[PDB]
Structure 1
Amino acid sequence: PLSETKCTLKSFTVEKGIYQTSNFRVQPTESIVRFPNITNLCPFGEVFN
């Protein structure tokens, strides 16, 4: 993190302080696919047969 600060500042001297060096994000690892009841019969069930 000190090197992160030196590279955000483009300085080899860092004064006491708070520096913004990056950005942290939580990334998705999985997915949820949710759809309505497939019990509501589709007319293809009437066209065929």
Structure 2
Amino acid sequence: ETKCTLKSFTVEKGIYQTSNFRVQPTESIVRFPNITNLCPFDEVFNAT
């Protein structure tokens, strides 16, 4: 990786700085729009 980020095949002694460090999040959470009142489709579908 150090060779790759320097575009050379020879690296001299010293301290370098390679690519960043990250942690991959896992799973997901989905939240519905906060509406709960049910539409009354029974009257139209079922009427005497």
TM-score by length of 1: 0.45
In structure 2, the gaps of 5 or more residues are none
Point out the structure with the larger helix share.
1
Structure 1 outlier segments of 4+, above 3 Å: 31-49
2:14 aligned residue: 17
Count residues with an aligned counterpart.
46
Q: What is the percent sequence identity of the aligned residues?
A: 98
In structure 1, the gaps of 5 or more residues are none
Bigger Rg over Cα = 2
Point out the structure with the larger strand share.
1
